[PDB]
What does this fold into?
Amino acid sequence: XXXXXXXXXXXXXXXXXXXXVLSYYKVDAEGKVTKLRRECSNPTCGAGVFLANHKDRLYCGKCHSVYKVNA
Amino acid sequence: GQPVNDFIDTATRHVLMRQGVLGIKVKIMRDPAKSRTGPKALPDAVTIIEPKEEEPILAPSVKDY
RNA sequence: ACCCACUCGGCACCUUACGAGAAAUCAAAGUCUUUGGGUUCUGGGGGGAGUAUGGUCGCAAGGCUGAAACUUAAAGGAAUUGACGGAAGGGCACCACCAGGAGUGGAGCCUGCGGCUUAAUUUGACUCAACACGGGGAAACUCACCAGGUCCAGACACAAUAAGGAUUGACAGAUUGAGAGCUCUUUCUUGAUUUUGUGGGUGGUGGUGCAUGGCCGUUCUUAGUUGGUGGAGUGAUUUGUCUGCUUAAUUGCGAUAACGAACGAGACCUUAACCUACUAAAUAGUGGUGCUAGCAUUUGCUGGUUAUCCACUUCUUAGAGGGACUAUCGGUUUCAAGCCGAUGGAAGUUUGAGGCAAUAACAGGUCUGUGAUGCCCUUAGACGUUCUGGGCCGCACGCGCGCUACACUGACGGAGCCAGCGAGUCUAACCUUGGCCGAGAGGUCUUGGUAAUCUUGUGAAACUCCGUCGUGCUGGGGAUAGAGCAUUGUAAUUAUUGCUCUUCAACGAGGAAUUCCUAGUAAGCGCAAGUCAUCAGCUUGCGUUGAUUACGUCCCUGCCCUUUGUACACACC
Ligand SMILES: [Mg+2]
Ligand SMILES: [Mg+2]
Ligand SMILES: [Mg+2]
Ligand SMILES: [Mg+2]
Ligand SMILES: [Mg+2]
Ligand SMILES: [Mg+2]
Ligand SMILES: [Mg+2]
Ligand SMILES: [Mg+2]
Ligand SMILES: [Mg+2]
Ligand SMILES: [Mg+2]
Ligand SMILES: [Mg+2]
Ligand SMILES: [Mg+2]
Ligand SMILES: [Mg+2]
Ligand SMILES: [Mg+2]
Ligand SMILES: [Mg+2]
Ligand SMILES: [Mg+2]
Ligand SMILES: [Mg+2]
Ligand SMILES: [Mg+2]
Ligand SMILES: [Mg+2]
Ligand SMILES: [Mg+2]
Ligand SMILES: [Mg+2]
Ligand SMILES: [Mg+2]
Ligand SMILES: [Mg+2]
Ligand SMILES: [Mg+2]
Ligand SMILES: [Mg+2]
Ligand SMILES: [Mg+2]
Ligand SMILES: [Mg+2]
Ligand SMILES: [Mg+2]
Ligand SMILES: [Mg+2]
Ligand SMILES: [Mg+2]
Ligand SMILES: [Mg+2]
Ligand SMILES: [Mg+2]
Ligand SMILES: [Mg+2]
Ligand SMILES: [Mg+2]
Ligand SMILES: [Mg+2]
Ligand SMILES: [Mg+2]
Ligand SMILES: [Mg+2]
Ligand SMILES: [Mg+2]
Ligand SMILES: [Mg+2]
Ligand SMILES: [Mg+2]
Ligand SMILES: [Mg+2]
Ligand SMILES: [Mg+2]
Ligand SMILES: [Mg+2]
Ligand SMILES: [Mg+2]
Ligand SMILES: [Mg+2]
Ligand SMILES: [Mg+2]
Ligand SMILES: [Mg+2]
Ligand SMILES: [Mg+2]
Ligand SMILES: [Mg+2]
Ligand SMILES: [Mg+2]
Ligand SMILES: [Mg+2]
Ligand SMILES: [Mg+2]
Ligand SMILES: [Mg+2]
Ligand SMILES: [Mg+2]
Ligand SMILES: [Mg+2]
Ligand SMILES: [Mg+2]
Ligand SMILES: [Mg+2]
Ligand SMILES: [Zn+2]
It folds into this structure.
């Protein structure tokens, strides 16, 4: 046929990063628990799901993307 | 010809083997005498009914009833 | 000298074959396993090789005598059937020719093929039997090619990672052709569905039609293939299956060691022709009647009226029948099969035209129709797939099929005005009448039809008639090109198609060559169907107008057949 070429640079993938995560939540001196990061007022996401903290940006990942709550 | 439609069944079948494939081709010609619902013979066939020896003569005479 | 009869001994031929032989053949090649008349010579698988060596003869060239090593499974004879020939004799045919028709080959464009060009211009096929072929009319798709971007739709098994998350997704920005979370930033989400690895799969218009199936084309516009009982032969085989005649035909007659048959041809089937006979019909039509228009008026003539009723089946439809069997008569022939002419006939060229179609062959074409398929390749930086964009259309030029022309048997313009084969919309937008608007293309409002019901009598084109032009590249011809308007489509640029104005090329009948054709045929002419969103200069069918010329032959070509040769049989590649 022909075989091969490449001006180079192959494309990669993704990782789902790492993170021992949900440390986010904080409980005081025995044993009251206060949530850090605020949750979602979409009926689909019964307020377990949180909003990621960027800039302007607070965002529901559970809603696969859906919705832009901003405080 | 037409008798083909009437009297022969055919089938082709592809038989897939380890090496390649073979073609089986079967042809059956059925007794037309037995036809049942169609023509009982080939268009070819021409039977003559076989007469009968006659013992003629017997000078006139007539029967009455 | 000549004729007849006989007889010795010659050179030969003929027919037989009791007899011989592996056969071809042989009055010897007979009198041979029922093996002996006399005698002489030579051979003992093929090659090595009539070679080496010694002897001998010769002027020589050479003659006579004449080994082995080694190699090898056949070499060889006769006949049989095939195949094949640049041998001979016959035949068949408008993919041959004769007599001619209409052309192509010259021109413009259309369209395939080569070639060149190209990022790519995807590819198969190259005499008939490749090149308007792959139903191949490609804007996306198709699509295979090129520039680039996603995705897994990587079954299953085992192992590994791993609930402290195996894995999944994404808003905005960056990026990107892109409102692709492709990747990146950032940090939520998801929960054992995946991920990683090996094994194994899977897809592929990737390769192989020289691995196959199937299908198809070609031989073949051909006429050939086989078996029973008999005859010949040790046998493979042959005769039957043939000199002739005849047919489109191994179709028949006839001849005959053959007789009588079967596949194939024929029969059969389909379609086109004929039925005042049959059965019928508001989804076909005719006559009467009513309702009614117009013109004459003296009855009349020409229409309207899917039902106002009555009757019919000539025309239309399709079931069932009938019909033709080359009939009658006559010429001709071996007085056979047949052929010819005349009359009759809807029909007498296999009635016309097709469908089916034996045995065998080809390294014909097709793996790019198939979830038909072997093997090879490839398989996540994909040859899987999808998305964006380009390409198959690229243009010094060679070849093929075509369309339109060169005008006056014509172009233009009024007017006349007649087909047949088709096809059309359900969970959809197909065939479209009618009304308006518009120069046109088209638009718009309604409408009938899943259809013998509506489009549609598809009022098709050539054609007919009355005019204009008047032989002038002319008002023949309409290539090329400019501007504008609409239609299909998400998309029209490289211009899908349609319309209007304008531009007005070559082409003044086409060298060598070469295609096709015998009656409703050729040629002219349009239409419907296929393809189809849009696009026919293509095909497949259809009807309309409708001739000239053969009704013969073997000169060219092609092919079949005998006879003949063969050292071929994988068969003259
Ligand atoms: Mg968190
Ligand atoms: Mg037949
Ligand atoms: Mg003999
Ligand atoms: Mg003898
Ligand atoms: Mg004698
Ligand atoms: Mg020897
Ligand atoms: Mg030697
Ligand atoms: Mg010597
Ligand atoms: Mg010597
Ligand atoms: Mg001398
Ligand atoms: Mg010697
Ligand atoms: Mg010697
Ligand atoms: Mg021979
Ligand atoms: Mg001629
Ligand atoms: Mg000519
Ligand atoms: Mg290709
Ligand atoms: Mg041919
Ligand atoms: Mg594409
Ligand atoms: Mg995707
Ligand atoms: Mg794997
Ligand atoms: Mg593997
Ligand atoms: Mg495939
Ligand atoms: Mg082949
Ligand atoms: Mg094949
Ligand atoms: Mg090939
Ligand atoms: Mg002919
Ligand atoms: Mg013969
Ligand atoms: Mg035979
Ligand atoms: Mg024939
Ligand atoms: Mg009157
Ligand atoms: Mg009157
Ligand atoms: Mg009738
Ligand atoms: Mg007559
Ligand atoms: Mg017929
Ligand atoms: Mg080949
Ligand atoms: Mg195939
Ligand atoms: Mg394959
Ligand atoms: Mg296909
Ligand atoms: Mg199949
Ligand atoms: Mg591939
Ligand atoms: Mg092309
Ligand atoms: Mg060519
Ligand atoms: Mg052609
Ligand atoms: Mg006219
Ligand atoms: Mg206007
Ligand atoms: Mg309707
Ligand atoms: Mg009609
Ligand atoms: Mg001129
Ligand atoms: Mg003109
Ligand atoms: Mg364009
Ligand atoms: Mg182009
Ligand atoms: Mg002019
Ligand atoms: Mg001419
Ligand atoms: Mg097109
Ligand atoms: Mg069409
Ligand atoms: Mg075509
Ligand atoms: Mg010889
Ligand atoms: Zn949410």
